[PDB]
Design a protein around this motif. Structure first.
Motif, mmCIF file in Angstrom:
data_model
loop_
_atom_site.group_PDB
_atom_site.id
_atom_site.type_symbol
_atom_site.label_atom_id
_atom_site.label_comp_id
_atom_site.label_asym_id
_atom_site.label_seq_id
_atom_site.Cartn_x
_atom_site.Cartn_y
_atom_site.Cartn_z
ATOM 1 N N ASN A 52 0.698 -1.229 0.108
ATOM 2 C CA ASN A 52 -0.266 -0.042 0.238
ATOM 3 C C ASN A 52 0.871 1.230 0.063
ATOM 4 O OD1 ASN A 52 -1.955 2.257 0.617
ATOM 5 N ND2 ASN A 52 -3.306 0.692 1.659
ATOM 6 N N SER A 53 0.755 2.055 -1.082
ATOM 7 C CA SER A 53 1.479 3.116 -1.144
ATOM 8 C C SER A 53 0.768 4.505 -1.333
ATOM 9 C CB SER A 53 2.572 3.134 -2.353
ATOM 10 O OG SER A 53 1.794 3.030 -3.434
ATOM 11 N N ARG A 293 -8.688 -6.861 -6.263
ATOM 12 C CA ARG A 293 -8.184 -8.064 -7.244
ATOM 13 C C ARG A 293 -7.782 -9.072 -6.290
ATOM 14 N NH1 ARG A 293 -3.800 -10.060 -10.462
ATOM 15 N NH2 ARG A 293 -2.561 -8.326 -9.878
ATOM 16 N N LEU A 294 -7.395 -8.905 -5.010
ATOM 17 C CA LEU A 294 -6.783 -9.780 -4.045
ATOM 18 C C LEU A 294 -7.462 -11.266 -4.478
ATOM 19 C CD1 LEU A 294 -4.428 -10.716 -2.348
ATOM 20 C CD2 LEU A 294 -5.971 -9.420 -0.512
ATOM 21 N N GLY A 360 -6.394 -4.495 3.434
ATOM 22 C CA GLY A 360 -5.327 -3.218 3.347
ATOM 23 C C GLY A 360 -4.014 -3.272 2.657
ATOM 24 N N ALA A 361 -3.593 -4.627 2.354
ATOM 25 C CA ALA A 361 -2.327 -4.962 1.701
ATOM 26 C C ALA A 361 -2.741 -5.777 0.335
ATOM 27 C CB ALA A 361 -1.585 -5.970 2.534
ATOM 28 N N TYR A 362 -2.369 -5.269 -0.680
ATOM 29 C CA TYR A 362 -2.239 -5.924 -2.015
ATOM 30 C C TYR A 362 -3.730 -5.826 -2.475
ATOM 31 C CZ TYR A 362 2.449 -6.788 -1.193
ATOM 32 O OH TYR A 362 3.943 -6.619 -0.936
ATOM 33 N N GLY A 363 -4.604 -4.977 -2.022
ATOM 34 C CA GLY A 363 -6.000 -4.788 -2.461
ATOM 35 C C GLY A 363 -6.047 -3.812 -3.581
ATOM 36 N N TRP A 364 -6.142 -2.498 -3.313
ATOM 37 C CA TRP A 364 -6.202 -1.475 -4.325
ATOM 38 C C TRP A 364 -4.782 -1.269 -5.158
ATOM 39 C CZ3 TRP A 364 -9.065 1.456 -6.980
ATOM 40 C CH2 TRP A 364 -8.729 2.595 -7.491
ATOM 41 N N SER A 365 -3.757 -1.575 -4.358
ATOM 42 C CA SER A 365 -2.457 -1.554 -4.957
ATOM 43 C C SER A 365 -2.248 -2.619 -6.145
ATOM 44 C CB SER A 365 -1.200 -1.595 -4.118
ATOM 45 O OG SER A 365 -1.087 -2.823 -3.486
ATOM 46 N N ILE A 366 -2.888 -3.759 -6.161
ATOM 47 C CA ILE A 366 -2.830 -4.542 -7.438
ATOM 48 C C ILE A 366 -3.583 -4.583 -8.355
ATOM 49 C CG2 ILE A 366 -1.584 -6.173 -5.497
ATOM 50 C CD1 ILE A 366 -3.997 -8.090 -5.908
ATOM 51 N N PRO A 377 -13.309 3.532 -5.981
ATOM 52 C CA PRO A 377 -13.844 3.718 -4.737
ATOM 53 C C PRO A 377 -13.274 4.867 -4.142
ATOM 54 C CG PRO A 377 -12.093 2.079 -4.866
ATOM 55 C CD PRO A 377 -12.062 2.745 -6.229
ATOM 56 N N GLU A 378 -14.115 5.120 -3.036
ATOM 57 C CA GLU A 378 -13.959 6.414 -2.210
ATOM 58 C C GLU A 378 -13.096 5.954 -1.036
ATOM 59 O OE1 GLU A 378 -15.901 9.095 -3.695
ATOM 60 O OE2 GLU A 378 -14.330 10.341 -2.637
ATOM 61 N N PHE A 379 -12.229 6.691 -0.365
ATOM 62 C CA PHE A 379 -11.244 6.571 0.582
ATOM 63 C C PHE A 379 -11.482 7.345 1.700
ATOM 64 C CE2 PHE A 379 -8.016 3.676 -1.359
ATOM 65 C CZ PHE A 379 -8.386 3.811 -2.675
ATOM 66 N N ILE A 380 -11.671 6.763 2.695
ATOM 67 C CA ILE A 380 -11.879 7.396 4.237
ATOM 68 C C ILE A 380 -10.779 6.546 5.162
ATOM 69 C CG2 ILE A 380 -13.270 7.301 6.115
ATOM 70 C CD1 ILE A 380 -15.854 7.136 4.197
ATOM 71 N N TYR A 381 -10.214 7.613 5.775
ATOM 72 C CA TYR A 381 -9.035 7.374 6.746
ATOM 73 C C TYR A 381 -9.536 7.742 8.134
ATOM 74 C CZ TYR A 381 -6.076 6.833 2.583
ATOM 75 O OH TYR A 381 -6.029 6.280 1.199
ATOM 76 N N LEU A 382 -9.629 6.763 9.062
ATOM 77 C CA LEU A 382 -10.137 7.319 10.538
ATOM 78 C C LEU A 382 -8.927 7.338 11.403
ATOM 79 C CD1 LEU A 382 -12.616 3.959 10.717
ATOM 80 C CD2 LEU A 382 -13.257 6.491 10.251
ATOM 81 N N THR A 383 -9.284 8.459 11.950
ATOM 82 C CA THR A 383 -8.206 9.057 12.983
ATOM 83 C C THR A 383 -8.601 9.158 14.403
ATOM 84 O OG1 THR A 383 -8.822 11.320 12.664
ATOM 85 C CG2 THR A 383 -6.992 10.131 11.118
#
Ligand SMILES: Cc1ncc(COP(=O)(O)O)c(CNCCNC(=O)C[C@](O)(CC(=O)O)C(=O)O)c1O
Ligand SMILES: NCCNC(=O)C[C@](O)(CC(=O)O)C(=O)O
Lengths: 383, 383
Positions: A52-53, A293-294, A360-366, A377-383
């Protein structure tokens, strides 16, 4: 469910369609604090951004990790947003002249050289620029034929070549044999092999064994979510191995991606349609495997959970099924667009939200984001 | 090689890196002219842009075809730039309310409804907007996939469609098979579509205006000389229209692969050659994140080799001849394989691999930004 449900309910209350990536940054920071602090003083943790980058993920991670492991000039550039060049380590079997010159220009900490020809391409740039470069030689131990690193018997000749190049600083070796290993006891034995191999070459060729990159490949369990990698058991036995093998003056590093970001990521999507075709039941979801794609790549049924939505936006009735073998698919026009095939679903309806855990790993990135030109897809980052 | 070699020689002469998609638009036009002219006057060719939705490709294609087949709001948006709305047909198993409203607003030619719930969602939008819409019903004829309406359920959806005043049922949509190379078997399948389509129209007592016969025209990747017999297919297809009395029934195909496959090339230079545990590898610039077709379909993709005589480096090339060699990209995954254990006559570092038949589902299905590599350059040959 507890983490994502407040987000899903807000999206429903606001009439926003649910096709989101949700990331728990609090849980990510907590997870990283534990992992990095448990390590011995001579060992380091680099984050491999392949998994994930996304910029926010790297922003959050940078504070806790020693540095970034990168596989291209594009990953170097993303890493340089939050880390200095001398905390970036560069691996890969096909580093171009452009990437090598860019890596040398920026002054990256190490280049993990994977061939004799790469070494010479690098060395030519170093003589041209009049710089020096710290390297590791990446080794392929005898398991199967792959494209990565120097074959075990070739390693001797690459050492001797690197030692007589004054612009090259041979720190030591880079091992990355396996990926996705769930056994902590076995991973300690892999590390023991790396130590013995690295020491033998160092003793044979008489150069200081300054550093060993032990690679990554720390596993994540997608079949059984309760049986994850026993990190505490690993680290404490890994500490014992260091003192037994006398590697206390050797600086070590891991380059982990999947294990760091997998469990904190979620792919959530609404059910658009449920249908029966020649007996088999299908649930068509918003988005698709071109966004996640995972499961198709790894050929497994990805773990999920069903949020039951109680309201109905249409004047007509929802399609519901109960306790059927249901295949989860996206919007794509290919039969390969399958998240999960013939899995038990107790209750599911149109308007419900499928929560794919461990995304979170090799989901969107691959994933092949723009296939059939669907919106991202929309991106939400919880803090 | 006649088509691409001038481009390869220009790049080498200019000292640009070779990582390119090259397209032969002249060849594409001749292919389109040949196909579109040969069809009977009651049948039209639509281009399924999933295969390749590059704007230059669509611009070239729009001149010859009747319209575009699309399966998302993004594909509609791309199609509208080169065709008008009333020459665009919209299919797919998960059409969102937003996509349906967009399609109705723009005034698309046909929506290919794949379920009862979609029909009802479309109808609710049509009554809200106070508009009508021409449709076909996608039928799944008796293996189970997520696509269309199950054969047994078709009768119920027809009756529901006929009662809806805002819906105009033109007829049916069949897309049963995918990548068929035999012309004779395709005529039988088209005959089966006629028998089923008439049977439903006569039973339910409405005029059979249109039949979408789908795509599924194959392209041979194993043996390049043995392609789909179009001239053979079209003449027996013409015979069949008269036999089954379908001259007044207006028809269409929706082809993607067959239109663009052979005119596209994925061209890349050899960065490294290495032996690992007995097996030879050639590391190429780019990878399967740029050209995923060989990995997805699990085959050795056909290629030619361009030899380059000069050496830019002061050290020697790695050169081999008459070796089984695996072709790989720059990625850090062992699944990054273009072709596996393929006999190569002669190859060196700095030579160029030319993957043929890379125009359909090459770039469009690929995971472009995995490991953040720069995209390949796109050249479209027109003279
Ligand atoms: C409704 C409808 N109409 C027309 C077409 C176009 O069909 P043709 O191009 O064959 O003529 C399609 C094929 N829909 C796209 C078919 N996809 C592929 O052939 C490639 C791939 O998606 C690769 C991947 O994603 O791994 C696959 O599933 O193998 C379709 O679904
Ligand atoms: N094989 C273990 C390593 N897995 C990953 O890092 C993910 C992926 O790179 C993603 C993929 O390209 O399918 C893969 O090779 O499955």
């Amino acid at each position: 469910m507890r983490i994502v449900q407040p987000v899903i309910e807000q999206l429903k209350a606001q009439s926003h369609p649910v096709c989101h990536y949700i990331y728990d940054l609090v849980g990510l920071e907590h997870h990283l604090q534990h992992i990095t602090s448990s390590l011995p003083s001579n060992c380091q943790m680099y984050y491999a951004m392949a998994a994930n980058s996304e910029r926010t993920i790297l922003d959050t991670i940078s504070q806790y990790v020693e540095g970034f492991e990168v596989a291209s000039q594009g990953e170097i550039a993303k890493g340089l947003a939050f880390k200095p060049a001398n905390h970036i380590i560069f691996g890969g079997p096909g580093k171009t002249d452009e990437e090598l010159r860019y890596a040398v220009s920026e002054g990256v900490q190490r280049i993990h050289v994977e061939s004799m020809h790469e070494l010479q391409r690098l060395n030519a740039i170093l003589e041209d620029e009049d710089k020096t470069q710290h390297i590791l030689l990446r080794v392929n131990l005898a398991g199967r034929p792959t494209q990565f690193g120097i074959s075990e018997d070739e390693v001797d000749d690459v050492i001797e070549a690197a030692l007589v190049m004054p612009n090259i600083h041979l720190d030591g070796f880079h091992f990355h044999s396996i990926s996705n290993n769930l056994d902590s006891n076995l991973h300690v034995d892999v590390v023991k092999l790396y130590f013995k191999k690295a020491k033998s070459w160092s003793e044979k060729h008489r150069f200081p064994l300054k550093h060993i990159n032990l690679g990554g490949g720390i596993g994540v369990n997608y079949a059984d979510l309760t049986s994850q990698f026993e990190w505490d058991n690993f680290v404490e036995n890994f500490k014992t191995l260091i003192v037994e093998q006398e590697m206390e003056d050797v600086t070590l590093n891991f380059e982990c991606g999947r294990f760091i970001v997998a469990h904190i990521g979620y792919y959530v999507t609404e059910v658009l349609d449920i249908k029966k075709v020649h007996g088999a039941w299908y649930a068509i979801l918003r988005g698709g495997t071109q966004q996640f794609r995972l499961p198709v790549s790894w050929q497994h049924n990805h773990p999920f959970e069903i949020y039951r939505y109680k309201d109905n936006p249409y004047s007509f009735e929802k399609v519901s099924i109960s306790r059927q073998d249901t295949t989860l698919v996206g919007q794509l026009c290919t039969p390969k667009d399958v998240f999960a095939r013939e899995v038990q679903i107790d209750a599911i309806s149109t308007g419900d939200v499928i929560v794919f855990k461990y995304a979170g790993a090799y989901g969107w990135s691959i994933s092949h984001h723009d296939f059939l030109s669907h919106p991202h897809p929309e991106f939400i980052y919880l803090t």
